[PDB]
Amino acid sequence: QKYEKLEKIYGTVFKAKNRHEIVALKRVRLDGVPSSALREICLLKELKHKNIVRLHDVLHSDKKLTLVFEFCDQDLKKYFDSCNGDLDPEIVKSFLFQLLKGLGFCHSRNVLHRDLKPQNLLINRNGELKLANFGLARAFGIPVRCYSAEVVTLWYRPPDVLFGAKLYSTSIDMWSAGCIFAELANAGRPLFPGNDVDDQLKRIFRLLGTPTEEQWPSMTKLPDYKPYPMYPATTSLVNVVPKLNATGRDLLQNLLKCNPVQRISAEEALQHPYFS
Amino acid sequence: STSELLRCLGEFLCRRCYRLKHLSPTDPVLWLRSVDRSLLLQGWQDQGFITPANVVFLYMLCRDVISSEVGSDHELQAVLLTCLYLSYSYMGNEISYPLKPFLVESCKEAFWDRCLSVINLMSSKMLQINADPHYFTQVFSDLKNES
Ligand SMILES: O=C1Nc2ccccc2/C1=C1/Nc2ccccc2/C1=N\O
Protein backbone atom coordinates (compact mmCIF):
# COMPACT_ATOMS: atom_id res chain seq x y z
CA GLN A 1 0.00 0.00 0.00
CA LYS A 2 2.82 2.38 -0.95
CA TYR A 3 1.49 2.66 -4.50
CA GLU A 4 -0.25 5.89 -5.45
CA LYS A 5 -3.20 4.86 -7.61
CA LEU A 6 -4.33 6.70 -10.79
CA GLU A 7 -6.53 6.13 -13.87
CA LYS A 8 -8.55 2.89 -13.87
CA ILE A 9 -7.55 1.33 -17.22
CA TYR A 10 -10.33 -12.35 -14.06
CA GLY A 11 -9.37 -9.00 -12.46
CA THR A 12 -8.98 -5.25 -12.87
CA VAL A 13 -5.88 -3.40 -14.18
CA PHE A 14 -5.14 0.09 -12.88
CA LYS A 15 -2.40 2.56 -13.81
CA ALA A 16 -0.56 3.61 -10.66
CA LYS A 17 2.64 5.21 -9.44
CA ASN A 18 5.00 4.84 -6.59
CA ARG A 19 7.32 7.45 -5.16
CA HIS A 20 9.36 7.86 -9.73
CA GLU A 21 8.10 4.70 -11.48
CA ILE A 22 4.65 4.19 -13.09
CA VAL A 23 3.15 0.65 -12.89
CA ALA A 24 0.02 -1.39 -13.50
CA LEU A 25 -1.83 -3.04 -10.61
CA LYS A 26 -4.04 -6.12 -10.95
CA ARG A 27 -6.34 -6.28 -7.94
CA VAL A 28 -7.99 -9.62 -7.14
CA ARG A 29 -10.72 -10.26 -4.59
CA LEU A 30 -10.22 -13.04 -2.02
CA ASP A 31 -13.93 -13.28 -1.15
CA GLY A 32 -11.97 -20.04 -8.62
CA VAL A 33 -10.57 -16.61 -9.56
CA PRO A 34 -7.88 -16.92 -6.80
CA SER A 35 -6.53 -20.36 -7.92
CA SER A 36 -6.16 -18.84 -11.39
CA ALA A 37 -4.33 -15.75 -10.11
CA LEU A 38 -2.01 -17.84 -7.88
CA ARG A 39 -0.99 -19.87 -10.93
CA GLU A 40 -0.25 -16.70 -12.89
CA ILE A 41 2.06 -15.48 -10.11
CA CYS A 42 3.94 -18.84 -9.91
CA LEU A 43 4.58 -18.91 -13.67
CA LEU A 44 5.60 -15.28 -14.07
CA LYS A 45 8.16 -15.45 -11.20
CA GLU A 46 10.02 -17.94 -13.46
CA LEU A 47 9.58 -16.36 -16.93
CA LYS A 48 11.91 -13.29 -17.18
CA HIS A 49 12.28 -12.14 -20.76
CA LYS A 50 12.06 -8.78 -22.52
CA ASN A 51 8.99 -9.95 -24.47
CA ILE A 52 6.99 -11.07 -21.43
CA VAL A 53 5.33 -8.61 -19.07
CA ARG A 54 7.33 -8.25 -15.83
CA LEU A 55 5.84 -9.02 -12.40
CA HIS A 56 7.63 -6.76 -9.87
CA ASP A 57 5.81 -7.64 -6.64
CA VAL A 58 2.80 -9.34 -4.99
CA LEU A 59 0.87 -7.67 -2.21
CA HIS A 60 -1.71 -8.94 0.21
CA SER A 61 -3.96 -6.50 2.10
CA ASP A 62 -7.63 -6.02 3.06
CA LYS A 63 -8.74 -9.33 1.48
CA LYS A 64 -7.10 -8.47 -1.85
CA LEU A 65 -4.11 -9.66 -3.82
CA THR A 66 -2.43 -6.86 -5.76
CA LEU A 67 -0.04 -7.99 -8.46
CA VAL A 68 2.29 -5.11 -9.41
CA PHE A 69 3.41 -5.27 -13.06
CA GLU A 70 5.33 -3.03 -15.44
CA PHE A 71 3.17 -0.55 -17.31
CA CYS A 72 2.80 -0.53 -21.08
CA ASP A 73 1.17 2.31 -22.95
CA GLN A 74 -1.43 0.11 -24.70
CA ASP A 75 -2.64 -3.38 -25.65
CA LEU A 76 -2.54 -4.43 -29.34
CA LYS A 77 -6.32 -3.98 -29.67
CA LYS A 78 -6.14 -0.29 -28.72
CA TYR A 79 -3.00 0.01 -30.85
CA PHE A 80 -5.15 -1.09 -33.79
CA ASP A 81 -7.63 1.73 -33.06
CA SER A 82 -4.92 4.45 -32.68
CA CYS A 83 -3.42 3.91 -36.13
CA ASN A 84 -6.29 3.16 -38.47
CA GLY A 85 -6.75 0.53 -41.18
CA ASP A 86 -2.91 0.23 -41.60
CA LEU A 87 0.35 -1.01 -40.06
CA ASP A 88 3.57 -0.59 -42.08
CA PRO A 89 4.93 -4.02 -43.25
CA GLU A 90 8.01 -3.45 -41.07
CA ILE A 91 5.83 -3.01 -37.99
CA VAL A 92 3.97 -6.22 -38.86
CA LYS A 93 7.36 -7.95 -39.06
CA SER A 94 8.65 -6.43 -35.85
CA PHE A 95 5.52 -7.40 -33.84
CA LEU A 96 5.39 -10.98 -35.11
CA PHE A 97 9.12 -11.35 -34.31
CA GLN A 98 8.78 -10.16 -30.71
CA LEU A 99 5.61 -12.23 -30.22
CA LEU A 100 7.40 -15.38 -31.48
CA LYS A 101 10.39 -14.49 -29.33
CA GLY A 102 8.34 -14.27 -26.14
CA LEU A 103 6.25 -17.31 -27.10
CA GLY A 104 9.35 -19.30 -28.07
CA PHE A 105 10.74 -18.44 -24.64
CA CYS A 106 7.60 -19.70 -22.79
CA HIS A 107 7.54 -22.95 -24.72
CA SER A 108 11.26 -23.51 -24.06
CA ARG A 109 10.58 -23.12 -20.28
CA ASN A 110 7.71 -25.63 -20.54
CA VAL A 111 4.82 -23.18 -20.32
CA LEU A 112 1.72 -22.95 -22.52
CA HIS A 113 -0.04 -19.58 -22.62
CA ARG A 114 -3.48 -20.81 -23.93
CA ASP A 115 -5.01 -17.38 -24.36
CA LEU A 116 -3.09 -15.64 -27.16
CA LYS A 117 -5.17 -12.78 -28.60
CA PRO A 118 -4.57 -9.01 -29.21
CA GLN A 119 -5.95 -7.95 -25.80
CA ASN A 120 -3.24 -10.05 -24.10
CA LEU A 121 -0.42 -8.44 -26.07
CA LEU A 122 1.06 -5.18 -24.73
CA ILE A 123 2.75 -2.47 -26.74
CA ASN A 124 5.10 0.23 -25.44
CA ARG A 125 5.58 3.71 -27.04
CA ASN A 126 9.07 2.42 -27.99
CA GLY A 127 7.44 -0.31 -30.13
CA GLU A 128 8.27 -3.14 -27.69
CA LEU A 129 5.72 -5.96 -27.58
CA LYS A 130 5.10 -8.07 -24.45
CA LEU A 131 2.96 -11.15 -23.72
CA ALA A 132 0.64 -10.73 -20.72
CA ASN A 133 -2.22 -12.36 -18.82
CA PHE A 134 -1.05 -15.84 -17.87
CA GLY A 135 -4.22 -16.62 -15.88
CA LEU A 136 -5.02 -19.46 -18.29
CA ALA A 137 -1.37 -20.53 -18.68
CA ARG A 138 0.13 -23.75 -17.37
CA ALA A 139 3.30 -25.71 -17.00
CA PHE A 140 3.60 -28.99 -18.88
CA GLY A 141 5.89 -31.99 -19.02
CA ILE A 142 4.65 -34.51 -16.52
CA PRO A 143 2.79 -37.25 -18.45
CA VAL A 144 -0.90 -36.48 -17.84
CA ARG A 145 -4.04 -38.14 -19.16
CA CYS A 146 -5.35 -34.73 -20.41
CA TYR A 147 -5.74 -31.01 -19.75
CA SER A 148 -8.89 -28.97 -20.39
CA ALA A 149 -10.66 -28.06 -23.63
CA GLU A 150 -12.04 -24.91 -21.96
CA VAL A 151 -9.12 -22.81 -23.23
CA VAL A 152 -8.42 -19.97 -25.71
CA THR A 153 -10.89 -17.29 -26.70
CA LEU A 154 -13.24 -18.56 -29.46
CA TRP A 155 -11.81 -16.59 -32.42
CA TYR A 156 -8.23 -17.79 -31.62
CA ARG A 157 -9.11 -21.40 -30.79
CA PRO A 158 -7.64 -24.09 -33.08
CA PRO A 159 -9.82 -26.75 -34.78
CA ASP A 160 -8.54 -29.65 -32.68
CA VAL A 161 -9.67 -27.85 -29.52
CA LEU A 162 -12.92 -26.83 -31.26
CA PHE A 163 -13.29 -30.56 -31.90
CA GLY A 164 -13.07 -31.03 -28.14
CA ALA A 165 -9.41 -32.12 -27.75
CA LYS A 166 -8.32 -32.19 -24.17
CA LEU A 167 -4.75 -33.09 -25.01
CA TYR A 168 -2.43 -30.70 -26.89
CA SER A 169 1.13 -29.44 -27.26
CA THR A 170 2.76 -26.00 -27.78
CA SER A 171 1.04 -26.08 -31.20
CA ILE A 172 -2.08 -24.65 -29.50
CA ASP A 173 -0.42 -21.17 -29.12
CA MET A 174 1.00 -21.44 -32.68
CA TRP A 175 -2.50 -21.48 -34.23
CA SER A 176 -3.35 -18.43 -32.12
CA ALA A 177 -0.14 -16.67 -33.22
CA GLY A 178 -1.15 -17.30 -36.88
CA CYS A 179 -4.55 -15.71 -36.30
CA ILE A 180 -2.78 -12.63 -34.82
CA PHE A 181 -0.36 -12.54 -37.77
CA ALA A 182 -3.42 -12.24 -40.13
CA GLU A 183 -4.87 -9.39 -38.01
CA LEU A 184 -1.54 -7.57 -38.13
CA ALA A 185 -1.28 -7.94 -41.87
CA ASN A 186 -4.80 -7.11 -42.94
CA ALA A 187 -6.24 -4.15 -41.00
CA GLY A 188 -6.37 -5.50 -37.52
CA ARG A 189 -9.69 -7.31 -37.91
CA PRO A 190 -10.07 -10.94 -36.75
CA LEU A 191 -9.54 -13.53 -39.49
CA PHE A 192 -12.25 -15.85 -38.03
CA PRO A 193 -14.93 -14.00 -35.97
CA GLY A 194 -17.41 -16.86 -35.42
CA ASN A 195 -20.66 -16.66 -33.38
CA ASP A 196 -20.10 -20.03 -31.66
CA VAL A 197 -18.08 -23.34 -31.94
CA ASP A 198 -20.00 -24.59 -34.97
CA ASP A 199 -19.80 -21.31 -36.87
CA GLN A 200 -16.09 -20.93 -36.01
CA LEU A 201 -15.28 -24.29 -37.59
CA LYS A 202 -17.31 -23.29 -40.68
CA ARG A 203 -15.21 -20.11 -41.12
CA ILE A 204 -11.90 -21.90 -40.69
CA PHE A 205 -12.82 -24.69 -43.11
CA ARG A 206 -14.40 -22.37 -45.77
CA LEU A 207 -11.08 -20.54 -46.01
CA LEU A 208 -8.51 -23.29 -45.40
CA GLY A 209 -10.40 -26.39 -46.53
CA THR A 210 -12.21 -29.06 -44.60
CA PRO A 211 -9.40 -31.40 -43.56
CA THR A 212 -9.36 -34.95 -45.00
CA GLU A 213 -8.65 -38.10 -43.04
CA GLU A 214 -5.50 -38.24 -45.20
CA GLN A 215 -4.17 -34.95 -43.84
CA TRP A 216 -5.37 -35.54 -40.30
CA PRO A 217 -5.85 -39.25 -39.53
CA SER A 218 -6.72 -39.10 -35.81
CA MET A 219 -9.38 -36.31 -36.12
CA THR A 220 -12.38 -38.66 -36.17
CA LYS A 221 -11.32 -39.92 -32.68
CA LEU A 222 -11.60 -36.46 -31.11
CA PRO A 223 -14.51 -36.37 -28.61
CA ASP A 224 -16.50 -33.57 -30.38
CA TYR A 225 -15.62 -34.30 -34.01
CA LYS A 226 -18.33 -33.58 -36.60
CA PRO A 227 -17.85 -34.13 -40.37
CA TYR A 228 -18.33 -30.74 -42.04
CA PRO A 229 -19.16 -30.47 -45.78
CA MET A 230 -15.99 -30.74 -47.84
CA TYR A 231 -15.26 -27.10 -48.86
CA PRO A 232 -12.60 -25.94 -51.38
CA ALA A 233 -9.11 -25.43 -49.84
CA THR A 234 -8.45 -21.89 -51.11
CA THR A 235 -4.71 -21.96 -50.50
CA SER A 236 -4.35 -18.54 -52.20
CA LEU A 237 -4.66 -16.68 -48.82
CA VAL A 238 -3.80 -13.66 -50.98
CA ASN A 239 -7.40 -12.38 -50.79
CA VAL A 240 -7.36 -12.36 -46.97
CA VAL A 241 -3.92 -10.90 -46.41
CA PRO A 242 -3.28 -8.56 -49.40
CA LYS A 243 -0.47 -6.52 -47.81
CA LEU A 244 1.60 -9.61 -47.04
CA ASN A 245 4.40 -10.75 -49.41
CA ALA A 246 4.66 -14.29 -50.88
CA THR A 247 7.15 -15.09 -48.09
CA GLY A 248 4.85 -13.81 -45.33
CA ARG A 249 1.96 -15.85 -46.69
CA ASP A 250 4.07 -19.03 -46.68
CA LEU A 251 4.78 -18.60 -42.94
CA LEU A 252 1.13 -17.72 -42.32
CA GLN A 253 -0.05 -20.99 -43.95
CA ASN A 254 2.44 -22.96 -41.82
CA LEU A 255 1.03 -21.46 -38.61
CA LEU A 256 -2.53 -22.05 -39.79
CA LYS A 257 -2.48 -25.85 -40.22
CA CYS A 258 -5.61 -27.69 -39.06
CA ASN A 259 -3.69 -30.78 -37.94
CA PRO A 260 -1.75 -29.61 -34.82
CA VAL A 261 1.22 -31.78 -35.82
CA GLN A 262 1.60 -29.89 -39.20
CA ARG A 263 1.97 -26.50 -37.32
CA ILE A 264 5.44 -24.90 -37.29
CA SER A 265 6.94 -24.19 -33.88
CA ALA A 266 8.11 -20.77 -32.63
CA GLU A 267 11.75 -21.68 -32.97
CA GLU A 268 11.29 -22.77 -36.65
CA ALA A 269 9.13 -19.76 -37.49
CA LEU A 270 11.92 -17.38 -36.32
CA GLN A 271 14.33 -19.06 -38.76
CA HIS A 272 11.74 -18.43 -41.52
CA PRO A 273 12.86 -16.50 -44.66
CA TYR A 274 10.12 -13.95 -43.94
CA PHE A 275 12.45 -12.66 -41.21
CA SER A 276 15.90 -11.28 -41.96
CA SER B 1 -0.03 -46.87 -7.81
CA THR B 2 -1.91 -43.96 -6.25
CA SER B 3 -2.82 -46.17 -3.32
CA GLU B 4 0.84 -46.87 -2.35
CA LEU B 5 2.08 -43.29 -2.89
CA LEU B 6 -0.51 -41.70 -0.61
CA ARG B 7 0.56 -44.05 2.19
CA CYS B 8 4.22 -43.13 1.58
CA LEU B 9 3.14 -39.47 2.04
CA GLY B 10 1.11 -40.20 5.18
CA GLU B 11 4.16 -42.07 6.47
CA PHE B 12 6.32 -39.11 5.60
CA LEU B 13 4.14 -36.73 7.63
CA CYS B 14 4.43 -38.98 10.72
CA ARG B 15 8.23 -39.06 10.27
CA ARG B 16 8.14 -35.23 9.91
CA CYS B 17 5.69 -34.15 12.66
CA TYR B 18 7.32 -36.07 15.54
CA ARG B 19 5.11 -34.09 17.98
CA LEU B 20 2.08 -35.98 16.63
CA LYS B 21 2.72 -39.53 17.84
CA HIS B 22 -1.06 -40.21 17.93
CA LEU B 23 -0.92 -39.99 14.15
CA SER B 24 -1.72 -42.89 11.86
CA PRO B 25 -0.48 -42.55 8.26
CA THR B 26 -4.07 -43.29 7.14
CA ASP B 27 -5.52 -39.99 8.53
CA PRO B 28 -3.69 -37.54 6.19
CA VAL B 29 -4.80 -39.76 3.29
CA LEU B 30 -8.44 -39.44 4.50
CA TRP B 31 -8.17 -35.63 4.51
CA LEU B 32 -6.81 -35.66 0.95
CA ARG B 33 -9.40 -38.17 -0.33
CA SER B 34 -12.28 -36.13 1.14
CA VAL B 35 -11.61 -32.89 -0.65
CA ASP B 36 -11.15 -34.85 -3.89
CA ARG B 37 -14.42 -36.69 -3.38
CA SER B 38 -16.69 -33.70 -2.78
CA LEU B 39 -15.17 -31.66 -5.64
CA LEU B 40 -17.05 -34.26 -7.65
CA LEU B 41 -20.11 -31.94 -7.16
CA GLN B 42 -20.52 -31.60 -11.00
CA GLY B 43 -18.84 -28.38 -12.16
CA TRP B 44 -15.87 -28.41 -9.83
CA GLN B 45 -14.29 -31.44 -11.56
CA ASP B 46 -15.45 -34.29 -13.82
CA GLN B 47 -12.45 -36.44 -12.78
CA GLY B 48 -10.21 -37.13 -9.77
CA PHE B 49 -7.13 -34.99 -9.38
CA ILE B 50 -5.25 -37.40 -7.06
CA THR B 51 -2.97 -39.42 -9.39
CA PRO B 52 0.57 -40.76 -8.92
CA ALA B 53 2.14 -37.61 -10.46
CA ASN B 54 0.03 -35.17 -8.46
CA VAL B 55 0.86 -36.95 -5.12
CA VAL B 56 4.54 -36.68 -6.11
CA PHE B 57 4.01 -32.96 -6.77
CA LEU B 58 2.15 -32.63 -3.47
CA TYR B 59 4.98 -34.40 -1.67
CA MET B 60 7.48 -32.04 -3.23
CA LEU B 61 5.69 -29.02 -1.56
CA CYS B 62 5.11 -30.76 1.81
CA ARG B 63 8.70 -31.91 2.20
CA ASP B 64 9.90 -28.29 2.06
CA VAL B 65 6.95 -26.67 3.88
CA ILE B 66 5.70 -28.79 6.82
CA SER B 67 7.59 -27.85 9.98
CA SER B 68 8.90 -30.61 12.22
CA GLU B 69 7.52 -28.59 15.12
CA VAL B 70 3.88 -28.62 14.00
CA GLY B 71 1.83 -28.39 17.19
CA SER B 72 -1.53 -30.00 16.33
CA ASP B 73 -3.40 -32.14 13.77
CA HIS B 74 -5.65 -29.19 13.01
CA GLU B 75 -2.51 -27.07 12.22
CA LEU B 76 -1.09 -29.87 10.09
CA GLN B 77 -4.35 -30.33 8.20
CA ALA B 78 -4.27 -26.57 7.61
CA VAL B 79 -0.83 -26.48 5.95
CA LEU B 80 -1.33 -29.83 4.19
CA LEU B 81 -4.55 -28.48 2.65
CA THR B 82 -2.86 -25.24 1.64
CA CYS B 83 -0.23 -27.28 -0.25
CA LEU B 84 -3.01 -29.35 -1.82
CA TYR B 85 -4.78 -26.17 -2.91
CA LEU B 86 -1.59 -24.94 -4.70
CA SER B 87 -1.27 -28.39 -6.29
CA TYR B 88 -4.80 -28.07 -7.70
CA SER B 89 -4.14 -24.46 -8.80
CA TYR B 90 -0.88 -25.32 -10.51
CA MET B 91 -1.32 -28.87 -11.86
CA GLY B 92 -5.07 -29.30 -12.05
CA ASN B 93 -6.86 -30.51 -15.19
CA GLU B 94 -9.37 -27.72 -14.81
CA ILE B 95 -8.56 -24.06 -15.27
CA SER B 96 -9.57 -23.36 -11.65
CA TYR B 97 -11.00 -24.73 -8.33
CA PRO B 98 -12.95 -23.25 -5.41
CA LEU B 99 -11.65 -22.47 -1.93
CA LYS B 100 -14.37 -24.20 0.14
CA PRO B 101 -13.01 -27.69 0.97
CA PHE B 102 -9.43 -26.41 1.28
CA LEU B 103 -10.12 -23.86 4.07
CA VAL B 104 -10.43 -25.39 7.52
CA GLU B 105 -8.81 -22.57 9.53
CA SER B 106 -10.93 -19.81 11.05
CA CYS B 107 -8.54 -16.97 10.08
CA LYS B 108 -8.89 -16.58 6.27
CA GLU B 109 -6.02 -14.01 6.23
CA ALA B 110 -3.57 -16.68 7.45
CA PHE B 111 -4.51 -19.08 4.68
CA TRP B 112 -3.61 -16.57 1.94
CA ASP B 113 -0.42 -15.53 3.70
CA ARG B 114 0.63 -19.21 3.61
CA CYS B 115 -0.27 -19.48 -0.12
CA LEU B 116 2.04 -16.55 -0.89
CA SER B 117 4.82 -17.85 1.44
CA VAL B 118 4.86 -21.32 -0.19
CA ILE B 119 4.76 -19.79 -3.71
CA ASN B 120 7.65 -17.42 -2.99
CA LEU B 121 9.80 -20.37 -1.88
CA MET B 122 8.68 -23.18 -4.24
CA SER B 123 7.89 -21.46 -7.53
CA SER B 124 11.15 -22.62 -9.24
CA LYS B 125 10.70 -26.21 -8.07
CA MET B 126 7.04 -26.21 -9.19
CA LEU B 127 8.20 -25.56 -12.77
CA GLN B 128 11.41 -27.63 -12.54
CA ILE B 129 9.54 -30.81 -11.61
CA ASN B 130 7.60 -30.43 -14.87
CA ALA B 131 10.47 -29.31 -17.13
CA ASP B 132 13.15 -31.61 -15.74
CA PRO B 133 12.17 -35.31 -15.81
CA HIS B 134 15.36 -36.41 -13.95
CA TYR B 135 14.17 -34.26 -11.06
CA PHE B 136 10.67 -35.74 -11.26
CA THR B 137 12.21 -39.26 -11.09
CA GLN B 138 14.36 -38.23 -8.10
CA VAL B 139 11.33 -36.94 -6.15
CA PHE B 140 9.24 -39.97 -7.06
CA SER B 141 12.14 -42.16 -5.86
CA ASP B 142 12.40 -40.30 -2.48
CA LEU B 143 8.63 -40.56 -1.94
CA LYS B 144 8.82 -44.30 -2.70
CA ASN B 145 11.64 -44.52 -0.12
CA GLU B 146 9.62 -42.82 2.60
CA SER B 147 7.80 -46.14 3.04
O1 LIG C 1 0.17 -1.77 -18.62
C2 LIG C 1 -0.15 -2.96 -18.34
N3 LIG C 1 0.55 -3.82 -17.52
C4 LIG C 1 -0.19 -4.97 -17.57
C5 LIG C 1 0.07 -6.09 -16.94
C6 LIG C 1 -0.66 -7.17 -17.00
C7 LIG C 1 -1.87 -7.14 -17.84
C8 LIG C 1 -2.23 -6.04 -18.53
C9 LIG C 1 -1.31 -4.91 -18.39
C10 LIG C 1 -1.28 -3.51 -18.91
C11 LIG C 1 -2.11 -2.78 -19.78
N12 LIG C 1 -1.83 -1.49 -20.10
C13 LIG C 1 -2.82 -1.10 -20.95
C14 LIG C 1 -2.98 0.21 -21.59
C15 LIG C 1 -4.09 0.39 -22.43
C16 LIG C 1 -5.04 -0.63 -22.67
C17 LIG C 1 -4.90 -1.89 -22.06
C18 LIG C 1 -3.75 -2.07 -21.19
C19 LIG C 1 -3.28 -3.21 -20.42
N20 LIG C 1 -3.87 -4.42 -20.34
O21 LIG C 1 -5.09 -4.61 -21.00
Determine the Cα–Cα distance for residues B106 and B102; give it in Å rounded to an integer. Answer: 12
Amino acid at B34: S
Determine the length of chain B.
147
Q: Say if the Cβ atoms of A32 and B96 lie within 8 Å.
A: yes
Which member of A75, A115, A160, A173 is catalytic?
Answer: A115
Q: Give how far Cα A143 sits from Cα of A123, B58, B128, B136, Å.
A: 36, 16, 14, 11
Q: For A141, left (φ over 0), alpha (ψ -120 to 50), or beta?
A: left
Q: Give how far Cα B40 sits from Cα of A74, A115, B102, B118, Å.
A: 41, 27, 14, 27
Determine the Cα–Cα distance for residues A120 and A155; give it in Å rounded to an integer. Answer: 14
Determine the Cα–Cα distance for residues A10 and A33; give it in Å rounded to an integer. Answer: 6
Determine the Cα–Cα distance for residues A102 and A49; give it in Å rounded to an integer. Answer: 7
CATH class of the domain at A1-73 = alpha beta
Around Cβ A198, how many Cβ atoms within 10 Å?
11
- What's the sign of the alpha-carbon dihedral A208, A213, A214, A219? positive
Q: Which resolution, in Å, applies to this structure?
A: 2.3
Q: Is the CB of A9 under 6 A from ligand 1?
A: yes
Q: Give how far Cα A154 sits from Cα of A79, A111, A224, A240, B96, Å.
A: 21, 21, 15, 19, 19
Q: Where are the domains of chain A?
A: 1-73, 74-276
- Reduce the secondary structure of A121-162 to three states and give it as a string: EEECCCCCEEECCCCCCEECCCCCCCCCCCCCCHHHCCHHHH
Determine the Cα–Cα distance for residues A23 and A72; give it in Å rounded to an integer. Answer: 8
In chain A, how many H helices and how many E strands?
8, 10
CB-based contacts of B14, cutoff 8 Å, min separation 6: B20, B23, B24, B25
CATH class of the domain at A74-276 = mainly alpha
Q: For residue B130, how far is its CA from the centre of ligand 1 (angstroms)?
A: 29
Q: Give how far Cα B16 sits from Cα of A202, B75, B77, B139, Å.
A: 58, 14, 14, 16
Q: Say if the Cβ atoms of B131 and A145 lie within 8 Å.
A: no
Instruction: Assess whether A115 carries a catalytic annotation.
Output: yes
Nearest to residue B34, comparing CAs of B23, B21, B22, B48? B48
CATH superfamily entry for domain B1-147:
Cyclin-like (1.10.472.10)
Task: Tell me the three state secondary structure of residue A261.
Answer: helix
Choice from A12, A13, A23, A131 to test ligand 1 binding pocket (greatest atom count within 8 A of CB): A13
Q: Say if the Cβ atoms of A142 and B112 lie within 8 Å.
A: no
Minimal-distance CA residue to ligand 1 atom 6: A132
Q: Is the CB of A78 under 6 A from ligand 1?
A: yes
If residue B104 lies in a helix (H) or strand (E), which one and from where to where? none
A39: which chain B residues are within 8 Å (Cβ-Cβ)?
89-90
Under 8 Å between Cβ of A158 and A172: yes
Structure method: X-ray
> Please, what's the b/e burial string for A80-112 (b: 16 or more CB within 10 A of its CB; e: otherwise)?
beeeeeebeeeebbbbbbbbbbbbbbbbebbbb
Task: Give B116-145 as a DSSP string.
Answer: HHHHHHHHHHHHHHHH-HHHHHHHHHHHHH
Interface residue A38 vs chain B (CB under 8 A): yes
Amino acid at B130: N
Interface residue A136 vs chain B (CB under 8 A): yes
Determine the Cα–Cα distance for residues B10 and A269; give it in Å rounded to an integer. Answer: 48
Determine the Cα–Cα distance for residues B104 and B74; give it in Å rounded to an integer. Answer: 8
